[PDB]
Curated annotation (Swiss-Prot), chain A:
Pathology linked to this chain's protein: Burn-McKeown syndrome: A disease characterized by choanal atresia, sensorineural deafness, cardiac defects, and typical craniofacial dysmorphism consisting of narrow palpebral fissures, coloboma of the lower eyelids, prominent nose with high nasal bridge, short philtrum, cleft lip and/or palate, and large and protruding ears. Intellectual development is normal.
Lineage: Eukaryota, Metazoa, Chordata, Craniata, Vertebrata
Disulfide cross-links: 37-78
Protein name as catalogued: Thioredoxin-like protein 4A
Signal sequence coordinates: none
Processing after translation: The disulfide bond seen in structures determined by X-ray crystallography and NMR is not essential for protein folding and function.
Species whose genome carries this gene: Homo sapiens
Subunit field text: Component of the precatalytic spliceosome (spliceosome B complex). Component of the U5 snRNP complex. Component of the U4/U6-U5 tri-snRNP complex. The U4/U6-U5 tri-snRNP complex is a building block of the precatalytic spliceosome (spliceosome B complex). The U4/U6-U5 tri-snRNP complex is composed of the U4, U6 and U5 snRNAs and at least PRPF3, PRPF4, PRPF6, PRPF8, PRPF31, SNRNP200, TXNL4A, SNRNP40, SNRPB, SNRPD1, SNRPD2, SNRPD3, SNRPE, SNRPF, SNRPG, DDX23, CD2BP2, PPIH, SNU13, EFTUD2, SART1 and USP39, plus LSM2, LSM3, LSM4, LSM5, LSM6, LSM7 and LSM8. Directly interacts with CD2BP2.
Swiss-Prot record, chain B:
Gene responsible for this protein: PRPF3
Gene source species: Homo sapiens (Human)
Ranges annotated as spanning the membrane: none
Portion of the full-length sequence here: 434 to 475 of 683
Disease annotated for this entry: Retinitis pigmentosa 18: A retinal dystrophy belonging to the group of pigmentary retinopathies. Retinitis pigmentosa is characterized by retinal pigment deposits visible on fundus examination and primary loss of rod photoreceptor cells followed by secondary loss of cone photoreceptors. Patients typically have night vision blindness and loss of midperipheral visual field. As their condition progresses, they lose their far peripheral visual field and eventually central vision as well.
Places the protein is found: Nucleus; Nucleus speckle
Subunit structure: Component of the precatalytic spliceosome (spliceosome B complex). Component of the U4/U6-U5 tri-snRNP complex, a building block of the precatalytic spliceosome (spliceosome B complex). The U4/U6-U5 tri-snRNP complex is composed of the U4, U6 and U5 snRNAs and at least PRPF3, PRPF4, PRPF6, PRPF8, PRPF31, SNRNP200, TXNL4A, SNRNP40, SNRPB, SNRPD1, SNRPD2, SNRPD3, SNRPE, SNRPF, SNRPG, DDX23, CD2BP2, PPIH, SNU13, EFTUD2, SART1 and USP39, plus LSM2, LSM3, LSM4, LSM5, LSM6, LSM7 and LSM8. Interacts directly with PRPF4.
Protein name according to UniProt: U4/U6 small nuclear ribonucleoprotein Prp3
From Swiss-Prot, chain D:
Role noted for this protein: Binds (via the RRM domain) to the 3'-untranslated region (UTR) of CDKN1A mRNA.
Known partners and oligomeric status: Interacts with HNRNPK.
Lineage: superkingdom: Eukaryota
Source lineage: Eukaryota, Metazoa, Chordata, Craniata, Vertebrata
Residues of the full protein shown: 369 to 474 of 480
Protein family according to the UniProt entry: Belongs to the RRM RBM42 family.
Signal peptide bounds: none
Name the UniProt record assigns to this protein: RNA-binding protein 42
Start and end residues of each RRM domain: 13-91
Cellular compartments annotated: Nucleus; Cytoplasm
UniProtKB/Swiss-Prot annotation, chain E:
Record function comment: Component of the 17S U2 SnRNP complex of the spliceosome, a large ribonucleoprotein complex that removes introns from transcribed pre-mRNAs. The 17S U2 SnRNP complex (1) directly participates in early spliceosome assembly and (2) mediates recognition of the intron branch site during pre-mRNA splicing by promoting the selection of the pre-mRNA branch-site adenosine, the nucleophile for the first step of splicing.
UniProt free text on domains: SURP motif 2 mediates direct binding to SF3A3.
Parent-record interval covered: 461 to 473 of 793
Protein name as annotated: Splicing factor 3A subunit 1
Organism placement in taxonomy: Eukaryota, Metazoa, Chordata, Craniata, Vertebrata
Localisation per UniProt entry: Nucleus; Nucleus speckle
Tissue distribution of the protein: Ubiquitously expressed.
Gene designation per UniProt: SF3A1
Record's subunit section: Component of the 17S U2 SnRNP complex, a ribonucleoprotein complex that contains small nuclear RNA (snRNA) U2 and a number of specific proteins. Part of the SF3A subcomplex of the 17S U2 SnRNP complex which is composed of three subunits; SF3A3/SAP61, SF3A2/SAP62 and SF3A1/SAP114. SF3A associates with the splicing factor SF3B and a 12S RNA unit to form the mature 17S U2 small nuclear ribonucleoprotein complex (17S U2 snRNP). SF3A1 functions as a scaffold that interacts directly with both SF3A2 and SF3A3. Identified in the spliceosome 'E' complex, a precursor of the spliceosome 'A' complex.
Amino acid sequence: SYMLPHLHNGWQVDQAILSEEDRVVVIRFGHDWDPTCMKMDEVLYSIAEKVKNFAVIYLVDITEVPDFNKMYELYDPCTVMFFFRNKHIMIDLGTGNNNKINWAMEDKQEMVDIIETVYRGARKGRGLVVSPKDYSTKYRY
Amino acid sequence: VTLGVYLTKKEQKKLRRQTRREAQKELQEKVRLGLMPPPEPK
Amino acid sequence: KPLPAPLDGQRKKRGGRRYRKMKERLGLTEIRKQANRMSFGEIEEDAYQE
Amino acid sequence: EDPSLLEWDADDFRIFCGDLGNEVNDDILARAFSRFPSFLKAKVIRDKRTGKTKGYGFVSFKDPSDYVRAMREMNGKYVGSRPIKLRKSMWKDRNLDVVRKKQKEK
Amino acid sequence: DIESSLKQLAERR
RNA sequence: AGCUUUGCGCAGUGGCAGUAUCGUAGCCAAUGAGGUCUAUCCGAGGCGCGAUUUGCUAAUUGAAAACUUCCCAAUA
RNA sequence: UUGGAAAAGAUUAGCAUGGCCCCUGCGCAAGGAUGAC
């Protein structure tokens, strides 16, 4: 499956980041073999037709284009990062850093809310968007 | 020859609303662009 | 099933017999008193009335 | 007094271009081509001896109808690091204040 | 289109 | 010759404004949508969408809430 | 007149505009009634 077209070329991915400016660009640097990236792709497909009018999500393979995993240092098996009009917005997840999500978010509503908040912060220009979630914990009990 | 036909009541209401809106918009465009000051709204 | 764009209102300039009717009928003004105060000194209701 | 409007008194359509970034549209604020003279005799005002722009900048188009059409079509459009909008200029010196005081209380 | 990528992913898993 | 009917569009006035005003773009619809009266009678709306748009003024918070320089010092 | 240092414009409320329902003056269609030594 993986209906989201993965930008094979690194320069193609960079141009795609420079392609759209009025919406949210999310790149899934996870390798499609691992099950975690499969769950991330499933979550994206859940929000494929929802956040489409406000965002443009693309997949990525760190093996295909390695420059993204060597310059941005995306060492996680499946890290979700955002870039808005040549500005990598930071989501205030609270996991020590804000460059990636790094978690296999199995909740479609949580992903949709995060996308909406990221879009609102990008519109407001805040480079560090306050994520409306307590991602610092496992959020399970 | 050149002859007309009847109209519709719903079409009449739509035409009246659209014509009033278009007249207001045309007046605003003509008197707000900067060619002639508009009067006070009465 | 599209999703509405993350956009809000531009600015507020109208009010009174143009937007006040909706804010008085639909979003009608509640008591706004005797229901928001807590009286941090005393205790009106029971300890576990809730 | 402020001897500034002497270089801009052209009976044109003047608009308020402000609430933008400090460096956004620093020198190309009039580079747009929505009309014939763009923002003629207009620039971005700034706070002197600080290297910073104080927001509002001059926006004066010599064509009134073209200015109105461009402002309506480009209200809050993407302008550099901060999309700014347009609104009617004040141009209210003391020659307007005297007449306003005369016509208000009388 | 997506068929080739899906087949490639499946063949490695 | 004066007036006037459906009244129309302009401009003024009065009132209404979430049930309403309208597009209704999805659908039926002058080739009948609907029924306790009227049933061999009546004959044009209804289901769902979305808002009630144009500007000015005061205030309000904030250090600043915006329209072309500024805080300073003996004089003129 | 002379002289030294230099919130990416927001919240809240009314007023008219604006939307429709009524009338008026205007403009005129098709007509309706009448005066015509």
